[PDB]
Amino acid sequence: QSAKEAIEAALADFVKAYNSKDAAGVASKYMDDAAIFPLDMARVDGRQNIQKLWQGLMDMGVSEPKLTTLDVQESGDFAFESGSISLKGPGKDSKLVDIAGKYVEVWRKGQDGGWKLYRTIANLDPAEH
Ligand SMILES: C=C1CC[C@H](O)C/C1=C/C=C1\CCC[C@]2(C)[C@@H]([C@H](C)CCCC(C)(C)O)CC[C@@H]12
């Protein structure tokens, strides 16, 4: 019932879609005009480009995403969330290592009543060029 519990549930489906290598399913968790802002990197705009991003990560051999949601605050048709992510991905030596990052993001109640991602700002913890 809680917005926090609703988002954590949505992120649970997010992880399942990714581990099934279903980039379209992953992208369906986003608003059509959603945007991702990786810090010191190019922003990714629109559902299809976001699908391309997650598909690209799958192709790289990125796997086992683990999401840790901190607090979630509701404001009108928006929900504000902060959290952290850990996953397995290739280093500059092509070897698979544990990679971590932090994020804040804004969800929006779509046409349905369900929560969909709208804005995400994220960074990879220092540790590929
Ligand atoms: C993985 C690797 C490690 C190997 C290469 O560095 C490529 C790389 C990219 C990581 C990214 C860049 C794009 C933005 C990402 C994917 C962040 C996500 C957008 C964070 C938000 C995740 C969610 C689902 C909670 O909303 C986390 C990691 C970031």
Q: Token pair 């559902």 is at which residue?
A: 47
DSSP character string of 1-14? --HHHHHHHHHHHH
Number of domains the chain contains: 1
DSSP character string of the chain? --HHHHHHHHHHHHHHHHHTT-HHHHHTTEEEEEEEEETTS--EESHHHHHHHHHHHHHHT-EEEEEEEEEEEEETTEEEEEEEEEEEEE-TTS-EEEEEEEEEEEEEE-TTS-EEEEEEEEEEPP---
Number of neighbours of residue 50 by Cβ within 10 angstroms: 22
Domain residues for 48?
1-129
- Using the atom order of ligand 1, give the atom closest to the CA of residue 128: 6
- Residue minimizing CA distance to atom 9 of ligand 1: 57
- Report the CATH number at residue 90: 3.10.450.50
Which technique was the structure solved with, according to the deposited record?
A: X-ray
Residue 86 beta carbon below 6 angstroms from any ligand 1 atom = no
3-state secondary structure of 108: strand
**Spacing, Cα 77 to ligand 1 middle (Å):** 26
3-state secondary structure of 88: strand
**Spacing, Cα 86 to ligand 1 middle (Å):** 9
